[PDB]
Amino acid sequence: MDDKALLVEVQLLESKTYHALSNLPKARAALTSARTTANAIYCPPKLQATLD
Amino acid sequence: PGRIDRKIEFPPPNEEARLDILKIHSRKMNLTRGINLRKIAELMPGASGA
Amino acid sequence: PKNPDLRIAQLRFLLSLPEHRGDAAVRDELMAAVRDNNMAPYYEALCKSLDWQIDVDLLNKMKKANEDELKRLDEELEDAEKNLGESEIRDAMMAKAEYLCRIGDKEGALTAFRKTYDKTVALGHRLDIVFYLLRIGLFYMDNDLITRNTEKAKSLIEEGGDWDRRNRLKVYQGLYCVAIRDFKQAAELFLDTVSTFTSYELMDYKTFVTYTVYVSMIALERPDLREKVIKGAEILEVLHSLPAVRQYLFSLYECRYSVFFQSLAVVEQEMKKDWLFAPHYRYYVREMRIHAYSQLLESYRSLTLGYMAEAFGVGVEFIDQELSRFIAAGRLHCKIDKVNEIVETNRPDSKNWQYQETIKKGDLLLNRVQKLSRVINM
Amino acid sequence: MSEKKQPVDEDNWDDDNVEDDFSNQLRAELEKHGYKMETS
């Protein structure tokens, strides 16, 4: 779809649960795909520290 | 033209030619499945081939 | 047709050979047998199960209908449509044999596969037929067909296409676990566990994880077992689903031996429900019981078997008799004792180990050039 | 090359070393080997 801002959070929420299943290389992979998506939004005003 | 008689250009390749060179160098590579090499060469308007 | 088919061959085993187990397999096989049009193999299976029931002639005319309905298709096809090779005659007549693999016995299916194998020219259609032979040789565990076509899959086919071989990597070591090769060849190429969806070519995933974790702790003790299965993370996801399997792992690695036997007790009894099962159970447990003893006698050289009476289980005389059987077996390199009640060990040194290997290999090559010198000189 | 000394002449596929070791020691290995603990 067209939206971008909601995608940064749900990529980030999966990086919690792949780490919650103790899958460390996949959670590194899903986090980096959340990084390259995060750089094109008006505000990640609180989602920045969540990502950090 | 007494010395050099054939003067041969080398333009940048076409979409079919970019498709073919991609087939050559991905030969030893290990492709997954479900993969379209044609759209990749469509993404290069004026590549070199190197 | 063949794709969810292997669960049937589980219930063929589970109903038959444990004679007490005749309660629940027939409850979800017969309703599956009146489904799926399964008609040719179950006659002997109905003999070992409850004797007869008249649904036989019901699906006999129904298996004759779909036989004739597609037989009249591809005979009219070959008499009207004139392409060959991988033509419409091809995929109709492989649909006849895949009607045979789902319904009929193996014999009509395999001769139709050999009928259609030499009519092909593309290796991808050849390998998919060899997929079918390997699966029907795995249905009826026939060890003659599976040894042949794997060599056909290696040599004659898979110098071409790619990553339809990992589907048969799981089949090469499906052969090795139904064989007694529970040692290294199974656990080596089970180790690439990146094949997820429970397909025909990946018959199950979660039980595949249990298969590759049972066989894994025999291939290697500590030449970095812990990196490939314990520091491995994609394996660690799905053994976080199964608590008993993970407890069986970490008891052995973190040296909890008393709960290790209770875990190993569940494993051997749970192993009983398996159809590649005959090489496992009498050999698997005794190899692991002597595996736990060998590392436990390591780090000590004056052990007392009274310390085995509570740190380990119970049964002073039980440890005594089982070590005595294993020392006399030529394994388990230590020396049990009576009234001092001190399990002393003896392990060789470097030189006492190297001297033994050179005198074994020395007499081998000496005998080898004995016989060779007698072949020459008349 | 006869010697004229002829005149007379996994199921069990690799089992006989393991079979010569143990054969019939209540091979279920649970009902006593794991069930010591009610005796102790």
Could you tell me which residues are beta bridge partners of residue D9? none
Residue A28 touches partner C, C-beta closer than 8 Å: no
Dihedral angle over CA of C376, D2, D3, D5, nearest 10: 150
| Six token digits for residue C222 | 């500590």
CB C34 within 8 A of CB C55: yes
Q: Strand ranges (DSSP E) for chain C?
A: 302-303, 334-335, 343-345
- CA distances C238 to B8, C28, C49, C255, Å, are 62, 27, 36, 23
The DSSP H or E segment spanning C315 is: none
DSSP summary character for residue D38: T
Given a contact cutoff of 8 angstroms between Cβ atoms, the answer to whether C284 and C330 are in contact is no
Q: Which of C282, C319, C326 to mutate to test the interface with D (most CBs of D within 10 A)?
A: C282
Pair A35, A9: CB distance under 8 Å: no
D26 touches chain C (CB under 8 A): no
Q: What is the DSSP string of B1-50?
A: --S-------PPP-HHHHHHHHHHHTSSS---SS--HHHHHHT-TT----
Residue A30: strand, helix, or coil = helix
Buried/exposed code over A39-51 (b: 16+ C-beta within 10 A; e: otherwise): eeeeeeeebeeeb
DSSP label of C334:
E
- Residue C315 C-alpha, separation from nearest chain D C-alpha, in angstroms: 6
Q: By the 8 A CB rule, do C99 and C84 touch?
A: no
Query: What are the structure tokens assigned to C180, written together?
Result: 């007694």
User: Which chains are within 8 Å of D by 3+ CB pairs?
Assistant: C
Contact between residue C283 and residue C182 where contact means Cβ atoms under 8 Å apart? yes
The C-alpha atoms of residue C227 and residue C109 are separated, in whole angstroms, by 45
CA C216 – CA C188 distance, rounded (Å): 8
Q: Can you tell me whether residue D7 is helix, strand or coil?
A: coil
Report how far residue C166's alpha carbon sits from residue C161's, in angstroms, rounded to the nearest whole number. 11
Closest of C336, C239, C315, C249 to residue C288, by C-alpha: C249
Contacts 24+ apart (CB under 8 A), A37-40: A37/A4, A37/A7, A37/A8, A37/A11, A38/A8, A40/A4
Experimental approach was cryo-EM
- Residue C117 CA to residue C156 CA, distance in Å, equals 13
Distance CA C233, CA C240 (A): 10
Task: Supply C104's token pair.
Answer: 């009929």
Helix (H, G, I), strand (E, B) or coil at A35: helix
Q: CB count, 10 Å around CB of D40?
A: 11
Cβ neighbors of C260 (< 8 A, separation 6 or more) are: C248, C251, C252, C292
Among A15, A17, A5, A12, which Cα is nearest to A43's? A5
Instruction: Give the DSSP per-residue string, C225-294.
Output: HIIIIIS-SHHHHHTTT-HHHHHHHHHHHTT-HHHHHHHHHHHHHHHTS-SS-TTTHHHHHHHHHHHHHH
Task: Report the distance separating Cα A45 and Cα B2, nearest Å.
Answer: 73
Which chain B residues contact residue C163 at CB under 8 A? 30-33
**CA gap C188, C287 in Å, rounded:** 18
Name the resolution in angstroms: 3.3
